[PDB]
Symmetry: D2
């Protein structure tokens, strides 16, 4: 079970807060933005993860995350000169991927939903690819998919559907070859169409009960932070807390939780971890 | 007119968001935290500013702020090995300060108030020192000052298990040149303490207190909680009252540190969001 | 046979001046009057016959809002009380309404949220005998009824030295024997028939279960201006980000087949100038 | 004599707000810690207006009286008139002809919330205008939804388009005595309503309409929906908590303008002593 996190980009819409800080290290309430797409991968049972970022920020991620062994993970890093193409992920990560299937998630994508893990299990347990769709109200702004669970149409910023394609994708090994033989528009949407034309593209539907934030602007960033702070405070759970997820899925034990909770013992984050482990 | 911004520290209460990012580069809504104490200095007419930070973060501030010439400022930088003592600021910055008076502001202090500039003018136009007091509800947690009617300080208790006032001392201070010598001859506490320096001035009857009461906001960005409160406050004021708080480009323009053409060039890289657009609207 | 009581009186004096001319339980929690929440909680437990107890002055205001509840497939009845002390006085005022049946009791300003709350409530309804109270973790047990459980072990109303972090919430399930308990109950020191006394009695008899609302559950008390705006923010946030409504009686009545799509559409008519009416139309297609 | 007078329009159905307005008047809904009507009322107080007519529905008018009384507790004279909800906001000057008499008159909508350090100065100017009318304009981003005004540099209005866009006209107006006669000789609009906009145009055609500009630093909330209601509440809670002041607190305003003294403040603060509202008032008087 392998996955890739795309954690580069400029976040230019976010100036000036991204002038000296990577977008994916901005706080979403009490956690760095990257904790979220990472937790999404952990929740799907993915433990070997390649993080692709900029030359300048990649060291910052390593300082934050290390090799991920503290959480029972294997984290690797690859710098890209940020040449256009999100589908370039499968090229940069060809070695990492090898012969295995692969999930891909954007570093600024925030997913929430009690049933997301089941949805992701199905996508892992699939040949072909699974994309995740989310009902929006402004399909024009997003890649739109129209589906049967099999995809019918795919229009990058059209609207034949209310469903936007999200930044979470599941591929079988054949994607690496697709990416390598892909003509520049390198677009993930093109790759996804290919699968659809082959009748190998399923669509996981995230409807009522799911939240999906894109952290485009200052506005959505503060809305995301307010959402996480609200859910956590009112419903007594943490969202995308890697230590908690690592513990609940037995990637690590209570003793390791306690050691990790040490440096966090000055705030509610460390305390929550101690409560949890008793 | 000179000032110092203390922008180091660990921000350990803020783990894990400060593990790989300096506290003073965290966003307060649409701006890096350091824009705020910096704007406070600009609003007092201070244009020559020394930023003291850590070895690791100082480069990050330079990448963000440069030499400040884009805003009509002169920004200099000094790394400190973070040896205990906030009053060590006057020692690290002895050369920078020279013979001039000096203001000092903490990098995580966020001040808001229509009349703050007038308050700061008075402090700049003073011998002695001016501290800024803010009415709190839990004086026990803060350095507390009890002052006279003339504005002269009477008492100074760093975290009084027994408070004599509701007024906390904030992280904004104005000193005359004599502070450099005070700092140099200061005995370490049970750290070189800004509170000790402030007492010295008070014992000399040279310490005024600027009062920030009704209409003023003062946020300390201690925790995750206060950080999200600070961000919500800024977003709310800005959206409902159509003004920006602590926007250096706007302040630079309004005080003629720069002209409209320079504003427009700066607004270019920001044109994908409301920040850039606000700056263009402003210059027409 | 499934019956419930909503306590919707009181002064809400902490809430002056907003409660000077408006009942606390008619204050908006985002897009709904406060009373929709505890009412929906009852509906979710399958309770359809509900007695609303309130003040002389406000009872008419509730009736104007809610009617007899037939629009939602319910039977709502009303009883005015002179606010004689005692929340446990509910079982006395409602003795006739209750008759021989079991009974649930909810406070008019209690707001419960949780995907699994309905299952929790099913279990409490399906309890042959005894009572079920609902516990929630609070950081200041001192101002709440405090429970310690195995079946309950200890109960203290506003304990100076609380023995646990678990507050007893304003949602209770009783068997028919509660009416007699209430009638033979001695007023407490403050001169009030106390729900906590009643709950202790059940516990002393080894008949008191505790439903635990832990991770995933929200419980708001609308004590102050602060908590009121927090509750509203919570509801607005959940609804907007997760595309569901919390405690929307029309939705609940439809999903549990108390009413059909045609009735939903008629009810959605007067609400068609806002998202609430539109949500109901979307729902029914 | 010349009496500063004002009218608050506090009826309507608030149908956009169902179901929260099914059994509660819109203007009694809380905006954070105060009934909605405290805000437009405070706006009037801040302009020195102390004689105020509150026009509302048959059903709600008693609820306002229970809340506000005759206003003497705050140094005011409040009077009430119930209208059958007949078409026309400009009908205010007809219903209130007797109340107004020979005086000038301000008019404010019961769901309008104004905030701004300098609002009082703006309002002083409008009260001190010897003749004509003053409307208050607010820069919006969607002029197409609001009455729009286009004005000169002197401050004189040029154009007035009810939902055009050539600045929205807000629900705060200042008139001289001549408005009563304008209202009485006004023809109903196409929707059969006596329109404040028609009245305002008349003044403009006469070159007697000034425009007070509320730009940077001013907030204006309309409490149209559930959304704006919770935004207004958040705004008031935020400003109050972060900046240590209350917005549109009548007791505070009455005290600061000497409508009442410290002893009267303390008596009023008594029933509010279980919350921060009562405590704020006690702190204030020491
Ligand atoms: N490794 C890498 N990742 C990228 C690059 N561009 C974007 N990403 C990541 C960042 C996001 O998490 C995700 C897509 O987000 P966006 O494209 O909206 O972020 P971007 O940095 O472009 O923000 P911006 O469009 O400048 O406002 O992919 C890139 O050139 N290289
Ligand atoms: N240059 C420098 N600045 C510092 C140092 N410690 C704190 N500061 C700055 C950071 C703050 O803006 C201000 C005082 O804030 P704090 O002491 O609460 O920040 P600190 O990083 O200690 O956070 P923490 O106490 O670890 O939660 O002074 C230091 O060792 N060196
Ligand atoms: N029928 C009736 N219901 C009441 C009475 N007192 C309180 N309730 C309701 C209102 C609440 O929904 C629930 C308990 O809430 P509270 O006792 O905190 O409300 P209360 O009106 O006392 O607010 P306050 O204590 O004045 O701030 O029981 C009463 O005297 N009669
Ligand atoms: N006395 C009186 N006042 C009214 C009437 N209609 C509206 N108002 C007040 C209520 C508001 O504070 C102000 C204008 O607000 P709106 O017309 O948006 O409130 P309305 O109740 O019509 O809300 P709605 O349009 O039904 O969503 O004038 C009325 O028929 N009679
Ligand atoms: Mg992009
Ligand atoms: Mg600090
Ligand atoms: Mg209560
Ligand atoms: Mg209307
Ligand atoms: Mg309106």
């Amino acid at each position: 079970r392998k996955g890739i996190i795309l954690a580069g980009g400029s976040g230019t819409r976010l100036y000036p807060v991204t002038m000296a800080v990577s977008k994916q290290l901005l706080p979403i309430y009490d956690k760095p933005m990257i904790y979220y797409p990472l937790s999404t991968l952990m929740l799907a049972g993915i433990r070997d993860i390649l993080i692709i970022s900029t030359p300048q920020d990649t060291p910052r991620f390593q300082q934050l995350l290390g090799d991920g062994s503290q959480w029972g993970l294997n984290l690797q890093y690859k710098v890209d000169p940020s040449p256009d193409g999100l589908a370039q992920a499968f090229i940069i990560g060809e070695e990492f991927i090898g012969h295995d299937d692969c999930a891909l998630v954007l570093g600024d994508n925030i997913f929430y939903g009690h049933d997301l893990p089941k949805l992701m299990e199905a996508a892992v347990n699939k040949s072909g690819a699974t994309v995740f769709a989310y009902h929006v109200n402004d399909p024009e702004r997003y890649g739109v998919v129209e589906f049967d669970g099999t995809a019918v149409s795919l229009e990058e910023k059209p609207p034949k559907s209310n469903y936007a394609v999200t930044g979470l994708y599941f591929y079988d090994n054949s994607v690496v070859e697709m990416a390598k033989n892909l003509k520049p528009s390198l677009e993930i949407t093109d790759i996804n169409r290919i699968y659809m034309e082959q009748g190998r593209l399923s669509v996981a539907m995230m409807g009522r009960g799911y939240a999906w934030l894109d952290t485009g602007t200052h506005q959505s960033l503060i809305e995301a932070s307010n959402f996480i702070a609200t859910i956590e405070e009112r419903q007594g759970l943490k969202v995308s807390c890697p230590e908690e997820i690592a513990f609940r899925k037995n990637f690590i034990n209570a003793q390791q939780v306690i050691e990790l909770a040490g440096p966090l013992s000055k705030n509610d984050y460390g305390k929550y971890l101690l409560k949890m482990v008793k």
